[PDB]
């Protein structure tokens, strides 16, 4: 996260850190004790297999995520229509081998319903352990920032992303830059508060550079994937 602030304990209790080879690679969001939403790009081959992955919940600092205390991932499911070239349909699910214990520091975010009626520039939050500057190292501390949704028509303008923003994508941030997601935050949440509920609007996906002007963050449009999520969760074990 560029231009954010250290997260407080229990502010973002759905945020997980997803590790491979004992280091943070990606973020994700808890939706049930066993299911995490993340980005398909995170789990491209050669990291498609669950064995690579552990999840850390309820812990703000990377140095307190101890080898052996993560939750092992049992299943990885990438969206069937994910396209690595365009990053279209950039969403994946991870299922944990053992369910998480919810408490004040670990709890789920709500999946977005059709008909949320968000404002065109709805105030949202992003969180993660991404770099705090373009080309930076992983953040030791979980950060968060306020971002606004950017209307798709604006984001698709010639001076921004010039027709690259599909219906499965939403833009957020600031066209002046300075506050944005960055490498390491991908897979993590874009959330908003409505009706006293926090909703998972997006999963951090891509953008050109980080925190550059006219190059905002692009997020998977979780609304369009909810029915796929339901169907995957229902199929599991059946």
């Amino acid at each position: 996260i560029v231009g954010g602030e250290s997260a407080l304990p229990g502010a973002w209790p759905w945020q997980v850190s997803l590790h491979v080879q004992n280091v943070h690679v990606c973020g994700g969001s808890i939706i049930t004790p066993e299911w995490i939403v993340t980005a398909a790009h995170c789990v491209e081959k050669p990291l498609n297999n669950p064995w690579h992955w552990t999840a850390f919940a309820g812990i703000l600092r990377q140095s307190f995520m101890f080898y052996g205390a993560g939750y092992q991932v049992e299943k990885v499911i990438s969206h069937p229509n994910y396209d690595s070239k365009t990053k279209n349909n950039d969403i994946a699910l991870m299922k944990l081998q053992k369910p998480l214990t919810f408490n004040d520091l670990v709890k789920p975010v709500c999946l977005p319903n059709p008909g949320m009626m968000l404002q065109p520039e709805q105030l949202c939050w992003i969180s993660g352990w991404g770099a705090t500057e373009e080309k930076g190292k992983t953040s030791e501390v979980l950060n968060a920032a306020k971002v606004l949704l950017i209307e798709t028509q604006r984001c698709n303008s010639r001076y921004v992303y010039d027709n690259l923003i599909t219906p499965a994508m939403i833009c957020a941030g600031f066209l002046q830059g300075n506050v944005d997601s960055c490498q390491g935050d991908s897979g993590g949440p874009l959330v908003t508060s409505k009706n006293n509920i926090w909703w998972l609007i997006g999963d951090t996906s891509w953008g050109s550079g980080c925190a550059k002007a006219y190059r905002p963050g692009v997020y998977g449009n979780v609304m369009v994937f909810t029915d796929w999520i339901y169907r995957q969760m229902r199929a599991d074990g059946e």
Binding site: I31, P114, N195, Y230
Partner: protein, 102 residues
């Protein structure tokens, strides 16, 4: 089963291909056990949080057929212009969406 929870108040709705329209479920004869069955159909396994009637902010409703057999909950609904209870189903499958400041 083409079904959704709609809006920030979780209105349970069923799609009609004939009408190209979504319809809320009448609270008539509904209960938390139907709530639980609907949640299972949406893939929530043994998660359930609440099922309550609310006022609907749509004319046509889906109504529960109490005289149906043991079929899937969505095969137990039919089209009705009328909802005697004047309320529709609001269904939450999991306690979610709360944090430090809630």
């Amino acid at each position: 089963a083409c079904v959704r929870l709609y809006g920030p108040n979780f209105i349970l709705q069923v799609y009609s291909s004939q009408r190209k329209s979504w319809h809320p479920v009448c609270q008539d004869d509904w209960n938390e056990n139907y709530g639980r069955a609907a949640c299972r159909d949406m893939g929530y396994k043994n998660n359930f949080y609440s099922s309550q009637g609310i006022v609907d902010d749509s004319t046509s409703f889906m109504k529960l057929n109490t005289s149906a057999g043991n079929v899937d909950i969505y095969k137990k609904l039919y089209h009705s212009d009328a909802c005697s209870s004047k309320a529709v189903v609001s269904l939450r499958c999991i306690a979610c969406g709360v944090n430090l400041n809630s």
